[PDB]
Amino acid sequence: ECSVDIQGNDQMQFNTNAITVDKSCKQFTVNLSHPGNLPKNVMGHNWVLSTAADMQGVVTDGMASGLDKDYLKPDDSRVIAHTKLIGSGEKDSVTFDVSKLKEGEQYMFFCTFPGHSALMKGTLTLK
């Protein structure tokens, strides 16, 4: 209940668009995998979390950071939690404190790979 397994395919699609984080969870974990056959330089997926208002700035500063920085600006204060950039057959997990979240606030999860954020995004809420 304090974790979720998310897949990102070769067709730039996450296998979920809504994540519910339970109230009693102290820690929340995201296990990201990548089915398919494409490398990370063309189809690298990451799971990034920020407020709805902050998403765009993270996506823009992210694309401008390059592949070596997992398409994320280093020390970006708007990023609550993030996995690394993964290619097909690779896996990565991230655990964050639920105390960094506010109940009732609109959160967005997304991939920061260039031109993929529009196709790879969804909501996260603390209920």
Side-chain angles (χ1 to χ4, degrees):
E1 55 162 51
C2 298
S3 70
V4 68
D5 272 70
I6 307 175
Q7 296 178 185
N9 60 27
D10 274 348
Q11 292 76 55
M12 306 152 296
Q13 303 167 314
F14 275 139
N15 73 345
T16 185
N17 62 73
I19 298 172
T20 293
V21 175
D22 197 77
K23 229 183 79 177
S24 57
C25 289
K26 190 73 160 55
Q27 313 292 304
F28 196 78
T29 307
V30 173
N31 304 305
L32 186 73
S33 61
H34 188 328
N37 304 298
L38 289 168
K40 83 174 187 191
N41 75 290
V42 307
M43 202 55 66
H45 303 328
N46 59 1
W47 183 85
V48 188
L49 189 67
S50 76
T51 64
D54 288 344
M55 180 176 153
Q56 189 53 63
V58 176
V59 171
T60 307
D61 292 357
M63 295 178 180
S65 299
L67 176 81
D68 62 294
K69 305 302 184 184
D70 293 313
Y71 283 114
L72 277 163
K73 188 176 78 67
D75 308 312
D76 199 318
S77 61
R78 302 167 301 193
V79 180
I80 301 170
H82 70 90
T83 65
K84 76 191 172 191
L85 207 76
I86 62 165
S88 62
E90 305 190 310
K91 293 176 178 179
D92 196 47
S93 310
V94 68
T95 300
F96 61 104
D97 298 303
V98 178
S99 56
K100 294 183 171 188
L101 305 178
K102 171 180 140 63
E103 52 168 41
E105 191 178 13
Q106 307 269 75
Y107 294 113
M108 289 298 291
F109 73 85
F110 50 97
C111 176
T112 53
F113 193 92
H116 293 194
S117 74
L119 294 164
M120 309 188 78
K121 54 168 173 52
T123 56
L124 179 136
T125 322
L126 222 204
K127 298 175 185 182

